[PDB]
């Protein structure tokens, strides 16, 4: 058991700062969408704004 | 019954027999098995350290 309870808790670490990562990751994606399409709004926006 | 000189003899018997235990006997015989003592107490300090 002393060599399987490093075993696990150095997997279970490694599973960790995957995942994570994973999270902060898709946080900016989802950012990047996010924000390109506001600028398709505002592009649109203007649009009317103009012929108006 | 009779009073005897093998009151003497048997106490020259008996402190020889003890040295004989002594000195070359009992610490090994201990020993030995404090050895053991130890490697069976530290199985529990080991699977601490495993399990912290």
């Known amino acids: 058991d002393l060599d399987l309870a490093k075993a696990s808790a150095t997997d279970q670490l490694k599973k960790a700062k995957a995942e994570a990562q994973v999270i902060i990751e898709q946080a900016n994606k989802r950012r990047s969408q996010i924000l390109d399409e506001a600028k398709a709004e505002a592009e649109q926006e203007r649009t009317k704004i103009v012929a108006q | ?52």
């Open chain 2, 1 to 52: 019954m009779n009073l005897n000189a093998t009151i003497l003899g048997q106490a020259i018997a008996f402190v020889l027999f003890v040295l004989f235990a002594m000195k070359y006997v009992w610490p090994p015989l201990m020993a030995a098995i404090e050895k053991r003592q130890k490697e069976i107490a530290d199985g529990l300090a080991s699977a601490e350290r495993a399990h912290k």
